[PDB]
Design a protein around this ligand. Structure first.
Ligand SMILES: *[C@@H]1O[C@H](CO)[C@@H](O)[C@H](O)[C@H]1NC(C)=O
Ligand SMILES: *[C@@H]1O[C@H](CO)[C@@H](O)[C@H](O)[C@H]1NC(C)=O
Ligand SMILES: *[C@@H]1O[C@H](CO)[C@@H](O)[C@H](O)[C@H]1NC(C)=O
Ligand SMILES: *[C@@H]1O[C@H](CO)[C@@H](O)[C@H](O)[C@H]1NC(C)=O
Ligand SMILES: *[C@@H]1O[C@H](CO)[C@@H](O)[C@H](O)[C@H]1NC(C)=O
Ligand SMILES: *[C@@H]1O[C@H](CO)[C@@H](O)[C@H](O)[C@H]1NC(C)=O
Ligand SMILES: *[C@@H]1O[C@H](CO)[C@@H](O)[C@H](O)[C@H]1NC(C)=O
Ligand SMILES: *[C@@H]1O[C@H](CO)[C@@H](O)[C@H](O)[C@H]1NC(C)=O
Ligand SMILES: *[C@@H]1O[C@H](CO)[C@@H](O)[C@H](O)[C@H]1NC(C)=O
Ligand SMILES: *[C@@H]1O[C@H](CO)[C@@H](O)[C@H](O)[C@H]1NC(C)=O
Ligand SMILES: *[C@@H]1O[C@H](CO)[C@@H](O)[C@H](O)[C@H]1NC(C)=O
Ligand SMILES: *[C@@H]1O[C@H](CO)[C@@H](O)[C@H](O)[C@H]1NC(C)=O
Lengths: 27, 552, 23, 816
């Protein structure tokens, strides 16, 4: 998909679908 | 013309003072500062007073007003000469709460000199200011920030409302649903087809809120002259674009409209047109004040009326008349010993949503790392002897509320019913076979009795007898067959054929008629005249003619 | 950078969001 | 007392559970987490077969976000006891957000939240939520940061049975159907084994009690060291977030922030995170060296106080971007102190600042470190305050930060009394005497909230049952102040003043607050302005609770108005209402029963019921028609209060039954009335007499009793007796027969006619009857008769106004 302006829970859903696994951890 | 004084209008009565003033003069500005406490009819009085004026000599000012929605009362106003408030401002508008509209849309005013002033107008609409641009004589390209408090006006009164299609799918006799066919993008659309209306965040969009009410004329306006109004029943917000209404009045003319609810910080909104519908012909109201009177032993007059709501259109009146089981002998106590006279009886709050908003933003930014025969149809039940109908039914047109009925059983109490009914509406005929029904209303009983007959079935075959002709005299007759109700006693009577003798009389039950069909008495020697009457459950009967015999 | 700054403030795209999707 | 800690302390720094259940192994054996802890993005928490009771505390805060496959948070933490709240995320301490599988918490082991608040949100499946008392688990000071919603309990969660378990605020206190909540005695504040058995207050989070009777604190009130609790650390050991730590280990230890890993600073006896004002961390980064202190930082926008964390320690703010505090909050939370931490360093800034769309800001007081903004643009506006529905005041009385350029822009600040703005003038370069009209809303700010105005007094001076009048006690300094102090109500210009206005309403409870701004929804009645300070009410409902208040309507664009508080009074008794649904019912020819009620406003202490019954003349013979023609077969029927029922002249019946009855009664029964006579009936309620009335209104106006109205009833039909008597028949010698009797002494009303009847003893014969309108019966001393020859029997029945009387008995006669 192209350009994005996601906000609200939509951004969380978009992140979840963009990758089903893997985040660098905060520390 | 009256060229009445300009100056301060601090209250409505001052406008009342200047009633009918076509012209207003006085170089001092016309100042409008009504602080009335929202008690309605502020606009009405203003028009009553000021609607006559067509031209203003000096400038005019308005500020600190309470409860004023607009200046629309200036119906006659045409132009402002603007004589100095100063030369800078022909018209001045400051700190006007609740104000949201200027002169009538089809009207155009002319401003003679200088500029205007518009700041601190929270409910006034910045776009509306530009409408004054052609009105000014100098024809400026736009009103500058110095003149327009754009950031200080309309911040919770925005107006860019996209029109919203809204249509029902159907309606019952008591309910309806609304289904906004216009599609709204809650997230940023990323440019799909059309998407004419949009919001930057689903959370900021509370949902659709529905307004509806009852209006036979379908002309109720959106706004109200009194800012406080409740004619519109208002419901809870929802986001599915569909709502269901219930507890509605059958076949009632309604009016409705919907609006978008969003955070106050958010300033985009959408809005629908005023639309109406009717709510199916429902159950009719039962007939009103039905009453009847007997015209004869065979005839009765029946009357009624329909004052209550029809809840549709009356297809036809339906009548049912029945013979109840005829009044029966009350053997509890004796007749004869005592006779009977044949008597008879008868604003929104956003706090919680925004609190969720910002906390969620911070969190996400932190986490991530890099009893009735309802057939109701005309019919008659005819007696076996065919002298009367034990039941009668009839359809009648809905344009007359009285009728007469005949060929009833001569003596009896009757039970009758009248009911109105509605049509087989197309919305219902598709499945009005799996019961459903409900076309016709319920009803109430009417009880009445017919009059007594021409004569009380005068007992016939009267004769007098004597055996072994000494033995007592005997009197014989055939019992009545058509008395007004059950016969209760026979009243035999006779007189001696001489001057000043009384004519005796008797009473007796139905005894001994089976044995010999006649009564006997050991009457003394002489010549007498004989007659008889009988009495039924309908009290007294009537007498027969005379017969004569000599005795010894 | 923070997502709320990189998205919902100024535009962005998935390929930019992929920076976060690292196991 | 110095004493043992429960279980050995195995501390471990902050850890994050992310993307995998396996990462729980990282949390092995920790007695405490010296930091924050979180669990997120575990969609399939089913493999959680292992639990960890060893841990009992985590210091900073907890967040649980987007986890499914987990039922109750107690599944992972059986024994988590306390949150020390050393750092508070978004001010909160407990956070659980958007976790669909979460129906329960079940954390019946936690005992104290040391600071901040709790936040469980949009976890739909959650149930048994409100039964948890969170006001007890927080600190006793002002700490109301409880936020709970979005669970659909009204339909999805009706399972709140609980055991029977303690019940307060009209519902049980629970975690689920099994685990009931428990408060230890008010002396404790959650430092207890159970509801009553508590250790020393040093034992935060409860305690373990050794079988030998030795207490064992689960956590220390102040600090810990070597599995012991003490009030202060030994010399040479710095305090680190729960415990005493050497300087070297403090250096090895670290405290985390959103984008930093700061190492511990052993300084002035505490393992400091970063230096205070006037100090800077040395290039060795092992201690804080003194400085000046001054520090520069970039401008920007502050949306949440979490971002405000980033600005701590900045003495200067640069960048042309207008600074904008844009925070909001459910309540008046820690925002003030957290912003104190974040901004107390800044004293100078390059560009202007705006505040808008903000909630919960009590004031800008936290900016006291500021001294000058210097302006920059937000074009040509020095300071901007727009739509902040909680801000009311800016700074301390002595704090005044100069503004060199631009004009202020204040709007929609409904709780900010404008008088505060009038203070801002000397800090602006032009030192003007007034603001330009486009600068500050004259009514868009402070109008909705009181936030000020001068105090005022008033007292009711006299009252009637229908009227009252009031009188202000405060002074009024019209023009030049004639008498300073003692409250003034100053109006520098007499032309500005107009007059006092009074408000009032009906209020049984007397807690209507004050005038309401919105159109309609008003219930107060306003009054015209008046000068003397005294005004009169009338047409008031008697004996009713009324509420009122007073305020100076004279705005005249003058901002020093005054206002009074609400006050209450009661009208005088007045006059009682009429008795309701009064009904009288016949019981016998001499007995009646009457019932009533008083379903209306008493208008005074009801003191009695005035029962009165007056005998009325019975209906009399009407000479309109001769009633022999047809019989009237049956009867038809439809001021100074005083006692003393009365009896008849012949003493046969009561003539009057004016009686005293208490308000206690609702019905009464009557006896010894006369048959077929009509009685007019009253029942009137009466109030007490006012102390003033019994010495001022004695002569007249009474009004102690209500209005009388007539109810009517008849004694029924008389008994059968006394119809006719002395019946006998005789002969005149062809000779006429004569019959005799004496008329009834007290018939059912006056005799209408005699009704004689006779019958032969012949079988099957029906009798014959005749009337007599009393004729000259007694002049002839008997009625006259002519019959045929034979033997006969006779009867008579009375015919009177009440209709037919019964027949008298028979006797027989022969004629030849
Ligand atoms: C109704 O829908 C039509 C398209 O079907 C659209 O062109 C029109 O603008 C809509 N009108 C309103 C009032 O929504
Ligand atoms: C009614 O709602 C449904 C979805 O519930 C939608 O598909 C349909 O288009 C709506 N009707 C109209 C006329 O838009
Ligand atoms: C609607 O019509 C009724 C009847 O003609 C009229 O009384 C009423 O004033 C009308 N209202 C509007 C808003 O047109
Ligand atoms: C009633 O309606 C019938 C047709 O159904 C018509 O013949 C008759 O004239 C009408 N009478 C009145 C009084 O309207
Ligand atoms: C009797 O019946 C006739 C015919 O239905 C009607 O015209 C008349 O009004 C009735 N009588 C009364 C008193 O209504
Ligand atoms: C927890 O401590 C025990 C010793 O008490 C140790 O054997 C075990 O390995 C530790 N847990 C882990 C996950 O290493
Ligand atoms: C504030 O100023 C007043 C005089 O206006 C002074 O009396 C007071 O001591 C000052 N307070 C502080 C804390 O400086
Ligand atoms: C109002 O009360 C004061 C005492 O509080 C009294 O001196 C004054 O006369 C009163 N006003 C009137 C008009 O009686
Ligand atoms: C105003 O009333 C208060 C009590 O409500 C009283 O203490 C005070 O002295 C009064 N002030 C004046 C000036 O009467
Ligand atoms: C306040 O008044 C309301 C009615 O307006 C009443 O329901 C409530 O109990 C009152 N509360 C108190 C504390 O008086
Ligand atoms: C009188 O009426 C009252 C009405 O409540 C009833 O309780 C009482 O028993 C009655 N007494 C008599 C003697 O009728
Ligand atoms: C009514 O009076 C009786 C006797 O005097 C007394 O025992 C009772 O409590 C009273 N009831 C009421 C409601 O006053």
């Amino acid at each position: 998909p192209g350009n994005h302006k996601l906000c609200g829970p939509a951004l969380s859903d978009a992140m979840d679908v963009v990758c089903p696994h893997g985040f660098n951890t905060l520390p | 013309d009256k060229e009445c004084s300009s100056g301060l209008i601090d209250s409505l009565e001052r406008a009342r003072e200047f009633h009918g003033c076509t012209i207003i003069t006085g170089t001092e500005p016309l100042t409008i500062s009504i602080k009335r406490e929202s008690g309605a009819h502020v606009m009405d009085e203003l028009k009553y007073g000021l609607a006559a004026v067509h031209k203003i000599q000096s400038s005019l000012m308005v500020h600190l007003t309470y409860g004023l929605k607009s200046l629309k009362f200036f119906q006659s106003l045409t132009e402002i000469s603007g004589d100095p408030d100063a030369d800078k401002y022909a018209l001045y508008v400051l700190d006007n709460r609740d104000l949201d509209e200027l002169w009538g849309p089809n009207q155009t005013v002319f401003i003679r000199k200088g500029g205007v002033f518009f700041h601190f107008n929270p409910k006034l609409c910045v776009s509306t200011i530009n409408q004054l641009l052609p009105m000014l004589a100098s024809k400026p390209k736009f009103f500058e920030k110095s003149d327009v408090g754009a950031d200080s006006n309309g911040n919770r009164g925005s107006c860019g409302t996209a029109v919203l299609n809204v249509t029902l799918q159907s309606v019952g006799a008591n309910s309806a649903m609304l289904n906004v066919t216009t599609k709204v993008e809650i997230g940023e659309p990323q440019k799909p087809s059309n998407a004419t209306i949009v919001f930057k965040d689903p959370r900021a969009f509370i949902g659709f809120v529905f307004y509806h009410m009852i209006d036979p004329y379908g002309n109720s306006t959106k706004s109200s002259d009194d800012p406080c109004d409740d004619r519109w029943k208002v419901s809870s917000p929802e986001k599915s674009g569909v709502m269901v209404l219930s507890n509605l009045i059958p076949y009632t003319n309604y009016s409705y409209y919907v609006r978008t609810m969003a955070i106050s910080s958010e300033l985009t909104n959408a809005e629908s047109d005023v639309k109406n519908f009717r709510t199916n012909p429902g159950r009719p109201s039962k007939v009103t004040e039905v009453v009847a009177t007997a015209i004869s032993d065979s005839k009765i007059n029946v009357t009624w009326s329909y004052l209550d709501k029809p809840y549709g259109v009356l297809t036809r009146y339906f009548i049912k008349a029945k013979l109840i089981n005829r009044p029966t002998r009350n053997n509890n106590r004796d007749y004869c010993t005592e006779p009977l006279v044949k008597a008879m009886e008868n604003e929104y709050d956003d706090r919680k949503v925004q609190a969720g908003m910002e906390f969620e933003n911070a969190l996400q930014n932190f986490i991530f790392v890099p009893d009735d025969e309802n057939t109701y149809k005309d019919e008659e039940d005819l007696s076996s002897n065919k002298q009367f109908y034990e039941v009668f039914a009839k359809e009648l047109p809905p344009n007359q509320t009285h009728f007469v009925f005949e060929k009833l059983r001569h003596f009896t109490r009757y039970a009758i019913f009248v009911v109105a009914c509605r049509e087989e509406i197309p919305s219902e005929k598709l499945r009005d076979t799996s019961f459903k029904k409900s076309l016709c209303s319920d009803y109430d009983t009417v009880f009445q009795t017919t009059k007594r007959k021409k004569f009380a079935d005068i007992v016939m075959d009267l004769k007098v007898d004597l055996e072994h002709a000494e033995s007592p005299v005997r009197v014989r007759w055939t019992p009545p067959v058509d008395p007004n109700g059950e016969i209760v006693t026979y009243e035999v009577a006779y007189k001696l054929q001489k001057p000043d003798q009384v004519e005796e009389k008797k009473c007796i039950p139905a005894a001994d008629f089976n044995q010999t069909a006649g009564y006997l008495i050991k009457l003394n020697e002489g010549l007498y005249s004989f007659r008889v009457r009988a009495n039924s459950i309908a009290g007294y009967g009537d007498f027969t003619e005379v017969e004569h015999i000599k005795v010894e | 950078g923070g997502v709320y700054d990189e998205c919902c403030v100024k535009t962005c795209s998935y390929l930019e969001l992929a920076i976060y999707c690292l196991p």
